[PDB]
Structures are given as structure tokens and as C-alpha cells.
Design a protein around this ligand. Structure first.
Ligand SMILES: [Zn+2]
Ligand SMILES: [Zn+2]
Lengths: 158, 158
């Protein structure tokens, strides 16, 4: 279900995750793309100033609610380097956004954390469709698994 | 599990939910209380302006992260008229807030919504601990069930 065009946007997400890591934040990047294929909004994690809710997917949900009609929201796609946490999946569904494509699943992330002896997140790694049963979800992208493993290990595996 | 002091705060949450209803918003109210019993912050639903994520528990999580140290957050309690949705439960856990007490469960509300035929929510009515395993949760408060049913009927009855 991941197309060539989808993978290009996922690579952009990975670049945004890398920007976040390099700035002292956590490696999570996300991009909102409308049905015409225009990038509307890009963001990355910004938790370093002490708000652990500063996730890019959440920013995208609020931005979409403020700037896009319901119909435009439903036809838009959200690309992300890492599958929406429950906070972000719920926000996405509350505002009525459409498709999600992720590079790595929360299952991947949680599995790596336990491999590395790292503490589990404070929030359960629920798949998007546990939280938001109606959302169309594609991913993960096999081509990006190694990159994201390495990027998460840098932040969370030390 | 629910003291008389807890009920006082839950009754304040009901008052805030009614304030929301009367202002054209949905009937959800929430209070943040310091471990020393002082109210720190109170809020209610503000969705009418077009943002379905304007939940008071979420506003509380962000307020807490901005204004309180981690230690003070861990020791604070959040009271709410309606059990946190997954968005809010996750945000509460991310910012490391403490106990939650709710007047009515999301299962209770979901059952009543179905009776009224109403559009089922896009977000699943997961219990807080499915989303946030480590959070201490108490509720519901049987003495406030009928009051809250009536408030919900006012907004969502058909
Ligand atoms: Zn998130
Ligand atoms: Zn909520």
C-alpha cells in the first residue's frame, strides 16, 4: 500500500526527525499533504522545552482544524516517521483528517525499546486503529526500518 | 475510592460542564488540584469555535507542563465530569500528572449516545488505563450518574 510517491514523503518525515534530533528534540517528523499533492504543513517534535505533548501530528491536527474545511481534511494525507501515539491518533480522528502513512509502527518502536533495555513510554503503544477505528492506515515502510532503528537508538537506546 | 472531598471537586466539574452547555459548548468540565488541596486551574469544553480537540483535560495537561515542575505534576490530581478520551488520557500521562477521578465513565456516555441514536464517535471509548497503564484512576461516582445523564441528554439527546 506504500507507493513511490508515499515513500518520498516518508523520507521527508525522516529528514524532519533528524532535524529534531540535531536540535535536541526527539526524532519524530510529520507532513500534511492535500489531495492535489501539495504539502500544506510540516513539523517535528519539540518536547525539549518541557512539554512532552509537543508532537508534530498533534500540531497538524490543530492546524488542519483551523485552516481546512472538513472536506479538505478528509481528503488530506498525514505522513509520519513514526506511527501516531494515542494522543495524536485521537486528535487526528477528532478533527476528521484522512489517511495516515507511517514509516515505522509503534510495534517496531516498542520492540526496539525492550531490546535496548529502555523504559516503556508512559503511554501504551496502541495501533492507530485501536484508537481511531475508521482511519485508513498504511505502513510501515521496509526501506526505512534500518534508518529509524538507528535514529531511535541514538535518542532512546543509550 | 471516592472521598467526600473528591465529590466536592467532581460537583465543581459538573458546574463547569453546565457552564459549557449554557455557552453552546459540550458538557465536559475538569479541575486540576495541587497535592496541598489548592485548585490550580479549571476548564471546560470549548469546541464550538470549530476545534473538536478543545477538551479541558488536554488544556490542563498543557497548563501543567507550562506552569508546574514534574514533582508538582506527579502529586496533582485531575477531576473530570467525563472520563478522559484517549487524546486526553495520553496527554495526562505524557506530562506525568497524577491521579484521575471521574464522575461518569466513557462507557456510560457511549451507552447513552447509542440509546439516542447519535453519531458514534470517531475515537474509541477506551478506558484510561488502556491508554495510560500507570495512571491511578478512580470513578465513576454513582451519586452523580443521573445528573450527568441529564446534562448529556441536554446536548446529545434526540
Ligand atoms: Zn503523539
Ligand atoms: Zn479528551
Amino acid at each position: 500500500a506504500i507507493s513511490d510517491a508515499d515513500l518520498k514523503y516518508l523520507r521527508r518525515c525522516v529528514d524532519l526527525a533528524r532535524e529534531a534530533l540535531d536540535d535536541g528534540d526527539e526524532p519524530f517528523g510529520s507532513v500534511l499533504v492535500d489531495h492535489t499533492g501539495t504539502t500544506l504543513f510540516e513539523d517535528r517534535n519539540r518536547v525539549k522545552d518541557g512539554d512532552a505533548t509537543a508532537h508534530p501530528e498533534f500540531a497538524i491536527a490543530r492546524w488542519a482544524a483551523r485552516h481546512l474545511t472538513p472536506d479538505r481534511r478528509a481528503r488530506a494525507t498525514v505522513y509520519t516517521s513514526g506511527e501516531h501515539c494515542p494522543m495524536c491518533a485521537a486528535a487526528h480522528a477528532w478533527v476528521g483528517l484522512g489517511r495516515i502513512v507511517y514509516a515505522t509502527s509503534s510495534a517496531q518502536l516498542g520492540g526496539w525499546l525492550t531490546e535496548w533495555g529502555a523504559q516503556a513510554p508512559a503511554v501504551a503503544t496502541l495501533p492507530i486503529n485501536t484508537v481511531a477505528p475508521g482511519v485508513v492506515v498504511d505502513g510501515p515502510a521496509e526501506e526505512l526500518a534500518e534508518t529509524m532503528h538507528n535514529l531511535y537508538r541514538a535518542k532512546f537506546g543509550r
